């Protein structure tokens, strides 16, 4: 997950 | 004048078509005409009363789309009205405005990195590409003051940035002005009185809850009241002389909450919540629909 978005990849 | 504040696309479970405004005078939300297409990661913007969102990404579950696309939504009849398109996609862009002509900063296209900057003229619906900055970014803060274009922090491919840099269009220039205290990118970039402020973001450790301000003249960078909620990828506005934060990801949920800068008393307060949470929304003020 990306930690600065929250969006999955 | 009923201004309101616009909160464009963003994201939770997948990239989020949503266009809602929010009055402060009343509290009330209301929710308007959807994007055309899907964005997180995009920058909205204001000029001429007009509406714009710029670039950012598609991330559904079939794929990832970055978006090199601008678009109008016009208050006056709640539609929405492609525009020319920028000469690359550009997610988790920078957007600012400097004499009605709108300033499209970083941002990224698959694993490239932008460090390109192009600028729109709404009226001839051209773009045209400027100075490029002097560090490629991605998830980077614009704001303008005096007619001069700050680009903040950010990821440059291999290390998140405590950099910033300005440009002064009448030499279109970059210049690299002092760097700020904490490492942030995807922090939240605004101006207010005579200041930049950058808060949240994500240093590379945690999301940040943190807030510090840069004098143009002074040239230091200040910390001012730590905002309630840790937050990276928020939306940023001002309005009436306040700071209006709203939602992002705070390593554990998809934020609903809006906080309120007042700058005489130097505290944040809890002023609404947007209908539902979600990151890496665009946000700019405008007048009421209708």
Known sequence: ?9 | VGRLIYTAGGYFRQSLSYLEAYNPSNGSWLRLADLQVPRSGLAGCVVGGLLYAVGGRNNSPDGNTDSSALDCYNPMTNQWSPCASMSVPRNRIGVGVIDGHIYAVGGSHGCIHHSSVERYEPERDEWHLVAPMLTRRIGVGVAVLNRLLYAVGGFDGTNRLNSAECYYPERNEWRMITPMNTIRSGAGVCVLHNCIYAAGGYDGQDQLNSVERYDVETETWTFVAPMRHHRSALGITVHQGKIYVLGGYDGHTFLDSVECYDPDSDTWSEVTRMTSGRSGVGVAVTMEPC
Do not use: A, C, N, R
């Open chain 1, 1 to 9: 997950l990306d930690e600065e978005t929250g969006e999955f990849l």
